Nucleic acid binder design. Structure first.
Length: 50
RNA sequence: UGAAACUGUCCUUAGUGCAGAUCUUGGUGGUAGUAGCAAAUACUAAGAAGAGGAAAAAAACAUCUUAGAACUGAAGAGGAGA
């Protein structure tokens, strides 16, 4: 569970959803030790639902 | 180095000697990898082509298709003329 409100607290509004994508890509790099991270279509759309 | 013209002496001739003219023309420095590349709400994910996203996150990736999110808001960032 990524507590995203910790990362996107007091972030500029127009750079919230794009920065949410970056944070997830960082956690995947720091966990699976890989660099080629491929988001799913469903995950992208949920971030942009709001 | 250069590869086909040139030199010394005597008279004669002069468009004859440059550090300046905010001199003329051309080339080039410090400034300096500095000031900047900040009006017009905004981009993200998957795939394709391509030498052109690699990697100890090098945090950013132009073009086209799909999906999401959006802007001009119809006296428009629409469709047409002089």
């Amino acid at each position: 569970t990524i507590h995203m409100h910790a990362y996107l607290h007091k972030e500029s509004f127009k750079k919230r959803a794009p920065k949410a994508i970056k944070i997830i890509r960082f956690l995947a790099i720091k966990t699976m030790k890989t660099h080629v991270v491929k988001f799913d279509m469903g995950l992208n759309q949920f971030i942009w639902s709001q």
